[PDB]
Amino acid sequence: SVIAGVFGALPPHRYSQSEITDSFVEFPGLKEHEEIIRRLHAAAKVNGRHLVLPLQQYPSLTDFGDANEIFIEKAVDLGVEALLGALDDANLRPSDIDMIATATVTGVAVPSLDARIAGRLGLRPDVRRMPLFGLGCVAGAAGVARLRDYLRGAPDDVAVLVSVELCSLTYPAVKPTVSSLVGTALFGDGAAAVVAVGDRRAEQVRAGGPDILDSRSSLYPDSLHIMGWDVGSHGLRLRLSPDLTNLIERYLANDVTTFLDAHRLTKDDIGAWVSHPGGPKVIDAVATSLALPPEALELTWRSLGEIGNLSSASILHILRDTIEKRPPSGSAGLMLAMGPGFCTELVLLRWR
Amino acid sequence: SVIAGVFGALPPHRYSQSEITDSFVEFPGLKEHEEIIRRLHAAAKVNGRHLVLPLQQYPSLTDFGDANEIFIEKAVDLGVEALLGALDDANLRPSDIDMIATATVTGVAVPSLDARIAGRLGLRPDVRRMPLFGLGCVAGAAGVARLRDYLRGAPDDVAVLVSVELCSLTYPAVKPTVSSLVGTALFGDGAAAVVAVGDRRAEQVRAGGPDILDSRSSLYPDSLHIMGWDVGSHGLRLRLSPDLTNLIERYLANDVTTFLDAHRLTKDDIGAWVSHPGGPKVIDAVATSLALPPEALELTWRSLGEIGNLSSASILHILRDTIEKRPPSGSAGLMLAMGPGFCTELVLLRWR
Ligand SMILES: *C(O)[C@@H](C)CCCCCCCCCCCCCCC
Numbered sequence: 001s002v003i004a005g006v007f008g009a010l011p012p013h014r015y016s017q018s019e020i021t022d023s024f025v026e027f028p029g030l031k032e033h034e035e036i037i038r039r040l041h042a043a044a045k046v047n048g049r050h051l052v053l054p055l056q057q058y059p060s061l062t063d064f065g066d067a068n069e070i071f072i073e074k075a076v077d078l079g080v081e082a083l084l085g086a087l088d089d090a091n092l093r094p095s096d097i098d099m100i101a102t103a104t105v106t107g108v109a110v111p112s113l114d115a116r117i118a119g120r121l122g123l124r125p126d127v128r129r130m131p132l133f134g135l136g137c138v139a140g141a142a143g144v145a146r147l148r149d150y151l152r153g154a155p156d157d158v159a160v161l162v163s164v165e166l167c168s169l170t171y172p173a174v175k176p177t178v179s180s181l182v183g184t185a186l187f188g189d190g191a192a193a194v195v196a197v198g199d200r201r202a203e204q205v206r207a208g209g210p211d212i213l214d215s216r217s218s219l220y221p222d223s224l225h226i227m228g229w230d231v232g233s234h235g236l237r238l239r240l241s242p243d244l245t246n247l248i249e250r251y252l253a254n255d256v257t258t259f260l261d262a263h264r265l266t267k268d269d270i271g272a273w274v275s276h277p278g279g280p281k282v283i284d285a286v287a288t289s290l291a292l293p294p295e296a297l298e299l300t301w302r303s304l305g306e307i308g309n310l311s312s313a314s315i316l317h318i319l320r321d322t323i324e325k326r327p328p329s330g331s332a333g334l335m336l337a338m339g340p341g342f343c344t345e346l347v348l349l350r351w352r
Numbered sequence: 353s354v355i356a357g358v359f360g361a362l363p364p365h366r367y368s369q370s371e372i373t374d375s376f377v378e379f380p381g382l383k384e385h386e387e388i389i390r391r392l393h394a395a396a397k398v399n400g401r402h403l404v405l406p407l408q409q410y411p412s413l414t415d416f417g418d419a420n421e422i423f424i425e426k427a428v429d430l431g432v433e434a435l436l437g438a439l440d441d442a443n444l445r446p447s448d449i450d451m452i453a454t455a456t457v458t459g460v461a462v463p464s465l466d467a468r469i470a471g472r473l474g475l476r477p478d479v480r481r482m483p484l485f486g487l488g489c490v491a492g493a494a495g496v497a498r499l500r501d502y503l504r505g506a507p508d509d510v511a512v513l514v515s516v517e518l519c520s521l522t523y524p525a526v527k528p529t530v531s532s533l534v535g536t537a538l539f540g541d542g543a544a545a546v547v548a549v550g551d552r553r554a555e556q557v558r559a560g561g562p563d564i565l566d567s568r569s570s571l572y573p574d575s576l577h578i579m580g581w582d583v584g585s586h587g588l589r590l591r592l593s594p595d596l597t598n599l600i601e602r603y604l605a606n607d608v609t610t611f612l613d614a615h616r617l618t619k620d621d622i623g624a625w626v627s628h629p630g631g632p633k634v635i636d637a638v639a640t641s642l643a644l645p646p647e648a649l650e651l652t653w654r655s656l657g658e659i660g661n662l663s664s665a666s667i668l669h670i671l672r673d674t675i676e677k678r679p680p681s682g683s684a685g686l687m688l689a690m691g692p693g694f695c696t697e698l699v700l701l702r703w704r
Pocket residue numbers: 020024055058105106136137138167168170171174180183184185187188227228229238311338339340
């Protein structure tokens with residue numbers, strides 16, 4: 001399988017980190033925690049973020065019903081904008097799509113996003129639907145792996161992954177507890193789409209982006225608590241452990257090497273790293289444990305600073321960013337993501 | 353792709369429909385509606401349902417946060433039971449599972465059920481996880497199709513589907529409302545797992561269950577309202593339109609005809625129908641639109657009456673009932689399901 005188009009889409013409201021913090025500190029029930037909020041927002045190394053709602057609308061977003069409704073309205077059109085952009089990058093059409101995978105962790109939609117996006121964009125009624133929910137930040141790498149897994153048995157097919165993460169809209173569940181504030185410093189809104197295509201279909205559509213060669217999921221034992229949501233009446237509340245960093249440093253190099261040994265490869269044999277940004281400590285951790293030079297994660301740091309942590313869609317934004325960089329032809333690309341599980345997901349890429 | 357195991361797990365607490373109704377109409381803020389409730393319950397053609405909680409805990413399940421936490425815990429125990437069971441039917445072991453897909457619409461878990469059941473069963477840390485959410489009732493059929501879609505690109509692998517639906521746990525969201533009351537007459541708790549196996553793996557494994565030949569999703573235009581969740585602070589509230597029956601009567605025939613024409617089959621060629629027991633009005637609409645004899649949907653009528661509507665898990669119990677009764681060796685089997693979308697999934701089976 002080979003990527004034919006990537007496309008990130010963001011809501012048009014872009015705010016500075018400063019503008020967001022300055023306003024956020026003045027939100028109901030928050031002024032008291034200004035010190036830690038500024039600390040956390042500054043330490044986040046996010047310089048700005050696209051929000052789906054005008055910044056000053058958030059204090060009014062206290063109801064999970066409203067929020068999740070706005071999510072469904074906004075997720076789909078961010079999703080279709082993303083999909084179309086990738087469809088056009090692949091010079092393909094909605095009718096060309098044979099399967100659609102949808103990745104979100106930040107909203108609950110039944111009928112799922114894929115159903116609604118497929119409605120909007122006029123996909124064939126018999127598109128295969130794969131609504132992925134609960135992969136979280138890992139869903140961008142994992143979604144790409146699942147496309148491979150699909151196209152592997154359907155060489156003529158077009159399979160799309162649409163990630164939409166509207167982190168902002170989980171605001172109803174946000175309280176001045178440090179974990180929620182950590183998330184309030186890092187997470188922004190945005191969608192992204194990957195149009196992938198089978199090997200046979202590849203030459204017909206002049207498929208540009210990288211070949212998706214292989215993936216390896218890595219579920220860590222006894223680590224449910226590391227990451228995820230505590231779901232409740234006030235909605236999706238971030239659970240996020242400080243232990244996470246130490247899981248990376250202990251075990252990521254192991255995942256990255258066992259997967260790379262399977263391909264007669266090394267750390268140095270990879271031409272562009274495509275890493276999810278949990279936040280700076282996370283980026284430092286994978287950089288440190290994988291003994292990565294500064295340049296290797298620069299795009300994901302740049303993406304972090306430009307649009308923040310978009311969860312699933314992040315790794316697909318920096319994948320789109322790294323594609324535009326045009327890295328060495330035929331060189332190994334390595335998607336690395338991680339999320340609730342706790343798990344990590346390596347995806348072996350090959351660039352053109 | 354070939355099914356190697358089908359197992360249906362239910363909670364130990366079984367209650368007659370009369371037991372349920374008599375206690376339900378005494379729950380807070382419902383005696384005002386005891387007439388319509390008893391009417392909906394009696395019309396439901398369910399004689400009994402397994403409930404994951406004692407019948408008299410439910411009135412205290414008013415909080416979505418509580419109900420969802422219990423969901424996660426109970427759904428993993430039930431989930432593993434069904435998987436262990438299906439693993440035992442397949443004579444296979446947890447270590448053999450190469451990909452696990454999980455289906456639920458009745459609770460929200462990040463990390464997902466597949467993450468948790470993988471940890472409980474000690475599945476290899478590299479299992480490929482596909483947590484489907486928002487397929488709803490269609491997920492048993494579509495889950496099998498996904499399995500097929502995975503196994504068709506990975507012929508040496510074992511893929512499992514674990515469906516766990518604890519409909520009773522959506523209780524915080526039920527109101528004295530026709531739709532939600534229809535839900536309370538139909539829906540019960542239970543799980544099921546299917547263990548399917550790639551083609552190159554079926555012979556060594558001795559998979560005995562039916563072949564998975566093909567599948568067709570039918571995503572109807574402009575039909576979001578037909579079925580779904582109203583999601584809010586009270587949890588998952590059933591949206592169910594009475595256009596459903598009419599949608600089926602007008603479009604189901606063309607779904608199966610367009611699908612069966614692709615295999616040059618008529619409805620007469622189907623040796624066993626594995627239909628989702630939505631409700632008596634839906635089973636009537638299926639039989640009427642497909643001109644089916646009353647023997648064709650008997651196994652699904654019987655599941656309905658015995659176990660109620662288990663959302664995605666029902667068509668899998670019925671599939672096990674079908675394999676039990678053992679259909680003519682080598683005849684066509686058609687799985688028929690419908691879920692939020694509005695969509696239809698047909699999966700073509702071959703009996704052994
Ligand atoms: C990756 O593993 C998963 C868990 C990603 C989940 C998304 C986290 C959302 C964090 C909640 C707070 C968001 C607020 C944004 C700022 C808006 C300003 C008012």
